[model samples]
Target: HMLTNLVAEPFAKLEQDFGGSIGVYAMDTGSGATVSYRAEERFPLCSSFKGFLAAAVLARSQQQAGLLDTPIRYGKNALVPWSPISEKYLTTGMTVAELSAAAVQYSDNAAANLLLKELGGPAGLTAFMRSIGDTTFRLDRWELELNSAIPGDARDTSSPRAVTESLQKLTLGSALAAPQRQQFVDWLKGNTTGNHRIRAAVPADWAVGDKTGTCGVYGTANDYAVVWPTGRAPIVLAVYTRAPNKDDKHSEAVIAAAARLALEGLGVNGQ
Candidate 1:
């Protein structure tokens, strides 16, 4: 079989093995070239939208420089129910920068909701999406509470192609200025959770910075990541899936399979 066949074989195997819907997009960040398998297919964003919120904050801060470090009051209204941080730290006031760290590094629900409010709420988030040339990203439900029961028509979604594009912009400094970009990158670098997908395959010390989103139930998920070696250009990978088994270990297996396929196609391997 040729390289294209090799690239596709694993996905086909996954469909049979996992019996779930999977969408993936991978790219060479330096060249802006993409290799996609169902890249246009949409899936629930889950907590992955925090990444979008992060982008929005950075974008807004650019228009008004020196605004990222500004302190903001965090109260009960800022909490996203069922979120780890919300359950852990209730009614604690922190700066925008600090909340951002919680959102990115810890995937804190309350922190993300607070940041989303500051960035313009769901409507503001929609506008930010449009500004980034992503017209498909729309929030049909607002303030629904984090990890709540998702309705059939919740309408929070994104595609692999769009996510890969957004990640590329962030890495290139086109989406945010130097200081804002550095903050975003720093937080992502410290992301301690890898139980979802992308980071499950790469080496622990490989400098993987990414986000994972999981729904209240098993199977509904989204994850996007940027992986770069010390000298080589970065590669952007986005995986959106609705698996029946929401177990992180199962998700990790799927992610590892996909990563192997992607790296093999790129003629590289995790060192």
Candidate 2:
């Protein structure tokens, strides 16, 4: 009850201060243990789905016995409208590793869609999710049209627990082989955008790799991050929120607080 109160109190305070529903989970991947508050429930994945997409690509690439230099093309139909990456850039061919980098680091919609196509479309992504024991995560056909199709309750979703588990697998060398895992980690290290939430909480020097997702709704935010310190174990965190008009700055504050609390619980301090 004390542990529950510790986690819940901060979330309640965040709601009072920020006005919204929040779900958070922090796990120690080395110990296969978690300290969670409302971790079992489902919520929209937003762009966090890209992490799984990257994983699928790595798995596929490994199974095919290919290098990161393998050529891949992004045609017109695979392009997603209004993405950060220009349509002109999509016309040129690039390697599979390049596409994965653009999709994850830049969060480019077209890049993600192209990679999704390479991974055998939405059906392939769903199959990969199932194989990883993430049965609750569903990829809707309209997921590609997320920014444009603003229907009621039309969020691409996953539970915090599922995300934590997926991340745990990635960190423990169980999800992808050494080469593929190194490629994914290298791409994540190059991510230069979206620095609100978990990214803001950790020390600037810490090796934290993450993906952030935000929906057009009044108060919807999702962030999943893994922190790896030099000698200590890696920590996986999943934070989701459904609050009204919650901006990136406020989301950062909540995530920073939650991260500090969790880290303190785990006896980790700035090195």
Candidate 3:
């Protein structure tokens, strides 16, 4: 209650100021201290699901031999409008490992769709989350459609707490083998789309890796990260936001501010 109360009011005020709702959950792996604000409430997963998608691929690689290096060739029709990485390799094609990296580091749409097919679509990814004991995480649709971010729809949604917990498991826990875990961390660390979100709030000295999601409607956007602060055990956190109005715009600044507050509430010194 103490920690919750400390950040609760500020979160409310922050969301109010942004004309939207915010959900956050942060955990210090060493101390197990947490900060939650509407943490259990569902927010659109948006494209943020790619991080877990790549993990699922790694998980599959454990049982299936040489799955990562398998070259996947797709047609020109497969490339989505935002698939920057996949479009360039359309003719030569990309391996499963390359596609996974493109999906995480560049949010490549075609790569994700192809990976989703490899995993057997939305339900396959959902099954992967369930296998990880994350019942709260669900992916009801594919990219583009999943990004609808419609108000009150739980089709492709997850709670902040669940996201952080599952992320901690996949990135730092036993959910992935040693090599796969390091690979996953490397992909996230190289992400180019999240500079303004959680990464912006972290101090320059700390090492951080994150994923960002923008639905482009209803002011819905999010970022989640595993941050290693100096000598301390890494902290995992997620910040998600949404508004009622369709025209409302999401704010990266607000996401960064909320992240700063989350770190502060956890007794971390940002200075």
Per-prediction TM-score, please?
0.85, 0.84, 0.97
- How high is the lDDT of residue 250 in model 3? 98
- Deviation of model 3 at 35, angstroms: 0.4
> In lDDT terms, how accurate is model 1?
0.69
In terms of lDDT, model 2 sits at: 0.69
Predicted candidate 1 versus true structure: per-residue lDDT over 1-271, tens digit per residue? 1323233436767755766777787886665555677777777777778877887887788787766778666566666554565555465566677777777767887778787777667788878888778877765444444333233333777788887787777755477778777767777777766545677766666677888776755466667888875667888888776754545222556766776566555655673
Lowest lDDT block of 10, candidate 1: 1-10
Model 3 misplaced stretches (Cα beyond 4 Å): 1-9
- For residues 1-271, could you state the per-residue lDDT of candidate 3 as single tens digits? 4445354438889999999999999999997888999999999998899999999999999999899999999999998879999999988999999999999988999999999999999999999999989999989998789988889999899999999999999999999999999999999999999999999999989999999899999999999999999978999999999999999999999999999989988888884
The best candidate by TM-score is: 3
1-271 per-residue lDDT for model 2 (tens digits): 3433232335667656767667777876665555676677766677777777888888887767774578776667766654665365666777777777777777777777777777777778878988877777766653455532232344467778788778767655577888777777776667755476777777787888887776656466677888886687888888876654434223656666666666655556752
CA lDDT, candidate 3, residue 133: 96
Best by lDDT: 3
lDDT score of residue 64 within candidate 2: 79
User: Residue 154 CA error for candidate 3 (Å)?
Assistant: 0.3
Location of the lowest summed lDDT over 10 successive residues in candidate 3 = 1-10
Clashing pairs for predicted structure model 1, backbone only? none
